[model samples]
Target chain A: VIVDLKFIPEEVEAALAGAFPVIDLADVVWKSFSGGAVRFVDRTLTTRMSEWVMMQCLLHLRQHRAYEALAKKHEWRDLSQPEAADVTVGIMGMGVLGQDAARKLAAMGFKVIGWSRSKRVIEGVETYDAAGLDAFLGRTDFLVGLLPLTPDTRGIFNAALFAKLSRNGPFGAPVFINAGRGGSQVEADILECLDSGVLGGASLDVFEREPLSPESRFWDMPNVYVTPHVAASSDVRALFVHVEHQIARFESEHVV
Target chain B: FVDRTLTTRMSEWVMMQCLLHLRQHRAYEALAKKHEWRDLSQPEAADVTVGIMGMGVLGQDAARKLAAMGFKVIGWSRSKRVIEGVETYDAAGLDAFLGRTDFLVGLLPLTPDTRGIFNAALFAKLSRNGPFGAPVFINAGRGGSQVEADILECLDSGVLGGASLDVFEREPLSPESRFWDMPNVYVTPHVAASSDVRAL
Candidate 1:
């Protein structure tokens, strides 16, 4: 059983009240390290393979199962391929993960632009800053926010942002994927945006409250993919475990 | 002169040649209008380790052109060819060929194994930083030959520097897709065949 550190190790020993044995958690960690099973796949394990795998696994697990069924249903039709000069994606925050996503989408022959607070150069991505963000919003077909919550970033993605994004567009409003901090979002504002058709859909992983209060409207929002902050948890654990494995592998396999 | 060459050929051959000529004329017109002639002066044919994915009628024509243009051309096939001065390898040797190629020109057919076959796993095997790193990828084959997500991952990681695609998994791709905004991608309307009318 997993126990919190706030509780005393000895008090918990008394609370067990019966035949259950008491064991230190640190012993498990030390034993695991001594066993020499963990491997570090890359030196930059957190940002590289580990982070990438985590995102893929979680995203795949949470996505509408219908998408998979549709894929298999249309196996012969092959809908994954796109026509020439089609599709445009807008990626906000332009950080490490965002940059990686944009780069990959561009390589797949999709049009991807990076939006940030300041102009940053990514070989194939068109950059936009706050100064021209309004215009960028109007032109985007899909939008992904990877911004972290800070004094300046907090409350920035509110109703005003959504309204501005939906304005001046003949096409339907962009789909939204918010992988950023939950505190940055105003769910009421998002519901407003959705009600007005300002956002086609949304995928939210982070939330303002832990467990997200089961009665929250987000639970029933037809267009939103609600996840309980699971995206970053497994990734952090996998990264550390992978690093341990890699250290052992390097010593045993490639080292002279 | 072009018409005269075709006129001297048999009826079936003459028809094929005429179709090819028309296609080339359109390609030349498009190129001229776009003013994209920088590559013409110093084509990739020189100093590039080229890999041809197909050895069929069209692939043979492309190979001949590359050979004429002074490319170190390597052809990949399931059966070996005896072309003089040309490096030939079967499917079993594709990994070794990929190790040496600087540019991969895919002319593969659309088959079960080949569909979406040019994915990250396969791209990983291609030389990216070895002695001969393949930086350019040109796919003139069927659009179904690649997986969009895999291509994006490889591109983001600098697995391949640039890509030229003539087809995609979807036609009239949704405006929301990422393919429309990227700068490293060069797109064509499945017109590479039209550019080489003489071969057609």
Candidate 2:
């Protein structure tokens, strides 16, 4: 018998007393860290990989004024808007989400570069390890953060890091997009850069304080876009399938 | 003279869809004015339908982008063109297409048959019970394809909810045009995507 665990309450876990193999739904869910603590009928979810990545692509297009130009029907215009083909997007975390984003962005003709704590090899993506951070940051026009929250990564998107991003690019300034853990960014630094023109624009899905107060100046900044922490929401059906596959593997490999 | 045409192509309709999504969720409105802290119910893209008229390159591209964003997509063209994942209709199926469309997008080229196609009578035929309570119209096509008078009339009489017009019948829309002042309307200086002059 298998027990489906949502939050693994201590009392519930004690009652079961290891009688059945436990399956924490949170383990199969996206953004499981936050879900591990909460008990609710419907919890706040993250945006799935496909939807979240596509949204970023669309936001990038929007940031370059593709929509505004189309609406004006202006004839004899310059090639001002940067195309994905011409841009290099560097992702900080080359994990499942980052790799997925890289593949999709690569398919859209972007030069994708990925950097993680350790070296990773993904086809069509130039990857860098911790030692190669400076070189990766130097060539990346758009910097995407998918780093998991850790003592070292907390507030990693500070002024010192922003100063390192590629300045000479199609966007004139490097753009920052953070869909990773909120703790990774220093919100004050993001605001300062947007105000100081050190950054071009930012699309933030996760923030230090969510429900990001209406009074928060991030809402008022034209260069900033915010969504209520839905960057990689779990899909119920997909989560179930993942758990079922894991269970089947466990039964075949371990039980047999 | 070089006689060179500098063509700047950007995902205009994709941007429009993004703008509409933001607008529907009160992103712009909330920014314009501070409000008491409260959560407002917003519609998801999966629950909306975006109907595109003129399934040409631009229209078809818009349909794909909107569909990718999770909106139900439908397309109609003068000729039957099959686009993957979009429910397409021909000229004969126009009324049915309009009836189900929550957001009506116009991408038709300017021609005699297409002139003033997005007029008052057409607005009346659009799906009344859309996500916005009334269907929204976005035209990045030819200005001649729409009648300004009919648009204003419908908007005033509640026949149409809102409109985003990128083209105008007359170049440099006159200051006298009511469209400029209408709260529900978004007017652009006719900057939609154009083909390369060499191609022309």
Candidate 3:
């Protein structure tokens, strides 16, 4: 098994030694273990997750949750909010998923920017490389967490990082949307920043632990919208198609 | 004449309304409240068609942006319109346009011919062939153009999947109105594109 980025080479080597030849181990690098090989090409998670990310951006900007809280009980109150054009959304990942999301958000009139470990060029979207992290953080009103968890990325989202997010935006403080790996964020920092208004709001789908402790503060935080890691669940049909294609290819011993 | 800036904001509201309904944000938020992670498949905009009625300035702007978002966008006007890259319908072809639309966007004004046009009879023509089975209604236009009773009845009867209303025939939508509490009916207080007094 090729371990996910969450595991370092040394840690994986130790685990691999226990299984050895009994379990096949391949040192490989690929996207979409279940969805990436071919299933990801189906555009399932690409559109699904991007749409959810776009929704969170709009919801936070529009104050829809606060309105719904009132509307559910029969009330009418107007909350002033910055439109998409008034805010800058800085996407942390500039891969396929990030590009698709940036395009859609741009169509909705958002001022979009992107950040990645390596330099990327997306027409109409200003991008920042790893070295320009602070400049990227300083300009965005909404931070999109689409980073894959690695030794360098783990706990990358913390108080120190949140403090740099633009606070002069319409929400007074920036918002965070994590549609990426759970291990990428530090939960305690998120809770603290949200409490102190360092971050005005958050829409967290991934977390440090799954089936979060029911008593988790995130469940009740008015500003935090939590989901049980279902932003982009694999489509069974797409998964089957992807698996079948791989199996047939392997049987044929087709050289790529 | 309105500020071109308002066009940007109004288009933003239109996009927001569509994303909220399309992404099922409310339902997920409810699930999140229970700390329950649900596994559900969602349709993307590229697979769905949005039919924008009232293809005037604001309407055309929204149609353009929504198309950029990958929705198959069509347009309709009381008179014939030739919007670039959009299949348009005139008064004579309204039903045909409705038949293909999975998301019906209302941006019509309170003109004599348009008043109360969004009734049950009109909604019945909307397509069920696309995702959501029942098409969703999104009105950022004048409330006078929609029949509140018809909007409510259609939502309850399943003729319409859901609605995101930013305007009403009556301003400050009354507390007594049934739209306030109806499931899937998003009620906003007619502030889709409020004027910036500071600019004046």
Candidate 4:
């Protein structure tokens, strides 16, 4: 058994024997792991991950970045912002974390939708499989990326995806928020799209590289917010309890 | 027209205000402006109790969402309304409701008894026993529902940690008004429900 928190040994992934097991003490993308791996998933991080998504959605839709700037300058602009009900937020993954985010967003009266590689059914959220990608993109005012990093999903959040996001929303352009795998997004494309008016705002908690390069333009970009990837940090005590419980359950079962 | 879209829109504003204060959004924005990567850990919604002073349609809608998103919700109303799944307090239960709240949301209609109700004595009753250790005042009700002087004093003296006010006692407040630059206060023109003109 291997317990790696934020990283997996991808090169040695071919060595997964039937009895070999992997654990992400971080409780992230456990189900997104290779179908061949022997792994049991944990989920305490789901609560905070979804909460971060909700927070970012509210921050962007309410024009808070601008409002904050106005606060520093002490100008209350005559800005007409959309209430949650005026918007449709699309969650790109239907996993546990994404579903929780959808549930919370729906409760706030935002029109919520979910999309995955395959179809999913979640109460109150309109679901879409990949067949209607363009349609989903067209309806979304805030595109939340929560998908796992996979061969198909790598660099999926390029200009093409941003270009397809709804331009007819109250935001004047759609906001892009990603808390999932960082490698899935193309940073250069994010910069270009933000510059060219294809995207209005972004709240990125993860980057293509950890401890993002100091020179990255995202640091000073208008309508962009950055956090040092603490969006879903696991509670240490709970993490210990989870591992202990799983180990006890496994040991009893594995005894010959 | 107020019956059609205001409930949803009004609740959204309240929710946003609650979170805006809860998560310390402005401070994080300040850090981002300096191009600094940092940590600002405060209370999560689950750690705090939210009290809604008016548990009517608008208040109930806010309570349900606030609870759904993990804040402990308690209700208070002048009319003694009851909402399933949420603990309720009436005129007599006011002290208990205020005593437990970290975030006090006032959505009450203006009345002879209700005006000037959010005074210092009332602010003093709000609970600071929660994780935040300080109470926040969010008034989406009427400007008259709160006393201007007491709200200001409470904020100044740390009895109130912050405020998100959509309405003010005085319309078109002077540019030099302290609220315009109060770090703990978020001031906006009185227009939470008038976002859509056709509704008006």
Candidate 5:
């Protein structure tokens, strides 16, 4: 019988010894299943989800009514609004998602920069390593968090981090958008920063708690936008095709 | 100086807002009270058609952004002005352009021929079977280009689905006006475009 694996543990290979094969449900399932004797496959959904997050953030910033006049049915306008060309989008985690977001944002005329634990070189994006975190945050007008969850990254988006964001940017304050793991940020600190004017706004897809209870203050906040953790849901059709190809290839190699 | 400078800039932003509202129903959500569930239908950007009048800087910039968002964009001008990726129509071509437009954007300068151009006759020609069930009007152009009575008549008779007016026949859009209370209409105080010093 086929075994379904999620967050493949160390005992996965041993458990698969008697099983026919295995399949991973996670998007980055390849990393956990690699080097195992059991045949398995993972689906890639990086591009589609990255584009969705970028579009959502852009629309919210440029169009979502934030002024009191819009609600009061009176005439008013925001003199501080800037187009994509006047802003800079700095992405944390220069991996597949980060890189794709950078390319698309750049094409839309926004200045793009990326930061990662290690050095990366993307043609249209200016990349930075760990040492450049402060500088990266300093120049960022729209900070996008796409870093994976790790011991070093947990609770990284705290007050100290918000303090480094650019103050002279358009919209008068830097905007933080996180589509990364929930563990990467401190929700309490995020609320504090928004209340204290350290951050102008935020769009969060992942949260410290799933379902983000209806009682949470973020739901009522004008500047904060919370969405269920659906930034990159796996496409079952694409996953099935990937599994079929991998299984056929595995069988072909075994026959030889 | 500030008002004139910001005119074109704000025009483009207002158009962007219109496109976003059509593609995703987020603007209303922002105005919604807590725990209020307003069921809204969002149409795909690529499925909506946006037709613009006046091919000046304001219209061109707006067209570029709409096209970038994957909307089917078309433009009508007094003369033949070409823009990449946008279908251009001239004076004689206005009739055909209106027939397919789901959202008609007015950016025409006030002139003898253009004044009162967005009348009931024009609204009736707009595509009736659009994604929104009726065509919408967005005017960021001169106030004189439209007739206030025609707009009210069309909106009441269902010749037009909705409207977003930045310029009006009269300034301040008197509190007594019915347009203020319309749920489907959006009104702004003649500030569609404003230039920021930093934008320069």
Candidate 6:
């Protein structure tokens, strides 16, 4: 692994070895993993491996033993080595990132169910249609949204919707995640819902407004977790080039 | 390490804490803030134009619900597909798909090529200046996989308008994430599944 900085200096390269094990730190520099603006070509396997590594890191962040026992009881999986329970991730969108995220999650022993706009088939995932969105949300422990923004979606989320889904009814609230765009929700409405205890807890990277005002109440909300929205991003130039390269590799390897 | 059973128990603990906090904060005040005496209602179906990307199971069902409500529905997929009366699009025809739609709902799959497909460039591609106001974006899929900076750029440039999200790159997003600070960005904790599973 070769890390790149905006400017690669001799001293910086020398200091890289001191930061960690010589084996782990091949070479280090600034902006090495920055996905955008700065671009670098990564091997396909390298990307896949990095994705798996990240998946494991995330799974361990909230490791739960009960999920493991339930998984085993259901005959979920049996890895070669002693591994953790496979946390099922319900990907609301079946696009590339959704598929890729699902794949990585699966690699970590978690089953992935991909929900697409239509009724299509994806290998290795229990597939469903958006018609099942309501029911899908009911059973999934982790719900991942990869939908796009449009008119039908504008202010789609409100107190009523959250209350309908999060109330202690047949289906309960699960851990929620949003890494897509920010145009889908109403800030005041979300705050209102959170205050009303209409959700389990929310982890949000996008907001209705950018550079949220200092007076914004979300900063004071405890159950809501916030990120600057750096989730699963791709390098524009590199991504395009990678696709082009994969097209070649696909032909050579007969991936099709 | 906590077992899955223990996690459930711990979750109950967390829920208790949440309930206590809500009570202390007078969370019910907002629920009561609304004006009294109104007919129970759901929004009219004809009021919204729903544009769905990826016409799979989720997309088809969403269309069914909207169409049942008598709303105008438009949809697009990588292939030339149709859902009874839906106006469909193929990979080559998304330009036209962008022109007429009002609400852009993403139900597409996440692949290497599709990652960050909702970037600044794609936002610029949307014909938001058409007869309708800028299209409001809603993602209920993988979060943080889309380029949020691009969305912000489009929001600033008036190319793309608003957005609603239910997923994020970071679980339990830190207090300092830039997204928390954005007023135009609407955040949800990937709750779309909650709606789906509850039915099971």
Candidate 4, lDDT over the whole model: 0.78
- Which segments of candidate 4 are over 4 A away from where they belong? A1-44, A69-78, A237-256
Task: Tell me the deviation in Å of residue A176 in model 6.
Answer: 2.1
Model 5 error, position A213 (Å): 2.2
Summarize candidate 1's per-residue lDDT along A1-256 as a digit string, tens digits: 3222222234334344442223435321222222112322233322332232222222222232233333333321222222212446677888876776676445333467789888888777888998989877766656677788988788667777776664333234656667678877777788788787877667666667655664676665656655444333222233334434555576783232
**lDDT by residue (tens digit), candidate 6, B38-94:** 111112224346677768766775565445334567888877896787878888988
Model 6 DockQ reads 0.01
Per-residue alpha-carbon lDDT of candidate 5 for residues A1-256, written as tens digits (9 for 90 to 100): 2334442243344334443434433311444322322332223346435545556556545645454346255534543566666678899988888887787677556778999988988887888889989999999988899999999899999999998999887677888899998899999989999999998888877888775665777777777766555454443333434445566676792221
lDDT of 2 by residue, A1-256 (tens): 2435443244234434433335543223334312232122222232244455555655565343443343344332334344555578889998777877787666545678999877888777889988998999999888899888999798988988898999888777988888888899999999889899999888877889765776778765666666666554333333333445556776791122
Model 4 pairs in collision: none
Off by over 4 Å in 1: A1-85, A166-171, A232-256, B1-200
- In model 2 chain A, the worst 10-residue window by lDDT is A33-42
The fraction of correct interface contacts reproduced by each prediction comes to 0.00, 0.04, 0.61, 0.35, 0.04, 0.00
The DockQ for candidate 4, computed on C-alphas, is 0.26
> Which is the better candidate, 3 or 4, if ranked by lDDT?
3
Candidate 4 residues A1-256, lDDT tens each?
4443333333124223332335434331333321111233335467767667888887787776666566556565657756678899999999988888988888777899899988887777789888988899999999999999999899999999999999888867998999998999999999998898898989999999987776789989878888877676543333334445656676881121
Candidate 3 structure quality by residue, lDDT tens digits, A64-151:
7788887877777887656678899999988888998998888777899999988988888999999999999999999998888888
Clashes of each: 23, 14, 2, 0, 6, 119
Model 2 interface DockQ: 0.11
iRMSD for each candidate structure, in the order shown: 23.6, 7.6, 5.4, 5.0, 7.4, 21.5
Q: Best-fitting candidate, measured by TM-score?
A: 3
Interface RMSD of 5: 7.4
Evaluated at residue A184, the lDDT of candidate 4 is 95
Q: What are the runs in model 3 whose C-alpha is more than 4 Å off?
A: A1-40, A239-256
DockQ of each: 0.02, 0.11, 0.33, 0.26, 0.09, 0.01
